[PDB]
């Protein structure tokens, strides 16, 4: 029991959901290294 806030037709003042962080700041970011295969001659292409 308890009709949803919508489809009833009257304006009201209800609640929300929030958080604390600035999110984009951790003082970091994904830091990845990549090692090159080496020679271009003996690389395998044939996996289908």
């Amino acid at each position: 029991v308890g009709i949803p806030k919508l489809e009833v037709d009257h304006i009201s003042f209800s609640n929300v959901v929030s958080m604390m962080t600035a999110n984009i700041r951790t003082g970091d970011d994904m830091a990845v290294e990549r090692v090159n295969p080496d020679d271009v001659r003996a690389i395998n292409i044939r996996n289908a």
Partner: protein
């Protein structure tokens, strides 16, 4: 009287150091005959054997 080690190798005379090969290590090493076409800078240093 007092020889630690003796041995056999390639005569560093018939195979002169100038016009031809070189021997500082055991292996008779010449410079550029078969260099691997496409690799890094430190490679091919063994293909000279």
């Amino acid at each position: 009287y007092g020889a630690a080690v003796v041995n056999i190798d390639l005569n560093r005379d018939f195979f002169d150091t100038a016009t031809g090969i070189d021997l500082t290590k055991g292996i008779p090493l010449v410079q550029d005959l078969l260099v691997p076409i496409g690799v890094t800078a430190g490679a091919e240093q063994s293909a000279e054997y």
